[PDB]
């Protein structure tokens, strides 16, 4: 769960603060995002995206309901949902979900 959380989708690790995030991850590829968890918040789920080098921040945002609207008019309740929907039409996050390169072995002796 949150904190160790399950190998899910191609951008599900684990929690990732945004610092880190822009900071760490020196962003050099064709385009992979990230989704990230609680930050400043006792269970918060955010969206990062990596560019050529920049680093975007667009929370996962909810509805007057409980569903994860980034937008508005693409709400919907499961992460995946989101990046489906932000697969070809990224009405909410501004870059479009390209690949999320696996971190499995990034470093670890």
Known sequence: GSGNSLEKHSWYHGPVSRNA????????????FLV?????SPGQRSIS???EGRVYH??????????????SESRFNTLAELV???STVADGLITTLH???????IHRD
């Open 21 to 32: 995030a822009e900071y760490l991850l020196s962003s050099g590829i064709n385009g992979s």
């Open 36 to 40: 990230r968890e609680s930050e400043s």
């Open 49 to 51: 995206l990596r560019y």
């Open 58 to 71: 667009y929370r996962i945002n909810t509805a007057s309901d409980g569903k994860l609207y980034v937008s």
């Open 84 to 86: 489906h929907h932000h």
């Open 99 to 105: 690949y999320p390169a696996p971190k499995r072995g």
